[PDB]
What does this fold into?
Amino acid sequence: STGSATTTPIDSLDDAYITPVQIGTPAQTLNLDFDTGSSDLWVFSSETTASEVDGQTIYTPSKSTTAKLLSGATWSISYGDGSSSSGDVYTDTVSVGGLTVTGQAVESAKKVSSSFTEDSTIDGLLGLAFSTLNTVSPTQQKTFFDNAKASLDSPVFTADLGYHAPGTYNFGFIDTTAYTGSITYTAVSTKQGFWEWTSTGYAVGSGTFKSTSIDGIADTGTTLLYLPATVVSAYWAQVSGAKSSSSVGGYVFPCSATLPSFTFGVGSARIVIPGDYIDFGPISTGSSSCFGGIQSSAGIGINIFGDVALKAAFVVFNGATTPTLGFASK
It folds into this structure.
């Protein structure tokens, strides 16, 4: 089997991407944030505290003839940005882009933090990291990909995110028309439960490439590119007036600037992030200070190749027995 679904930015800055997911019988379609940095499929639901729902589409298990309470199971998750959610669990039929998993754990939110409530366009998350990070207790549950894996033509999914435009998540096949040149594959460590890999270096603009190992995660659920302070300082030093602002919470730059590109290494290959991808616009409406799309990972504890980086590439998440990651230009 295969699946293919379009993913759409939630706003004009590509702050996140939503992908329609069919849950239950008859189908209830919710728009989920596919997140390669976590491993829970959770949704706003009929059980979510009413005051914490503000415009989201909810899953109502009582209206699904295939929903079954997973008796005793609860979940609770905290994300890197400080957001959180928790609740109980149902199993139900879940389909993405024509690919159907029966018995998928669907984690029903009883509580969500304010950032989720405030995001009316995101109806929940679909985790695509390794199932070892799944938070369901006392019986840990498998991700949608893990459940689908054996049925897929090939044990892979791909992320092809758009810049200010829709893109595609495919399951079970590699669309050879969706990228240019060849795919360069690189080793993955699953020791922390992430799609963790080591970039071979970077360049700023038309500058020379610096060979240096940068361990990080491929994370579709993180907006920006978070890299070591040394790397980030070298980038922003090439933008007149750019500075790190403690008050704003990162690097800002004059909105009048033309940003240089940023290149990262994948083995001997190179992925170029155009300067425009690094512009996240005014810090507040009408401001002439703009927020940067490359930020320091210092104090996160991990480098994160988020959407800013991933959307510059066609990315293969290879879930073979020895998982790997592939990157191609597009």
Summary: The CA atoms of residues 70 and 90 lie 5 Å apart. The first helix runs from residue 114 to 118. The first strand starts at residue 3 and ends at 9.
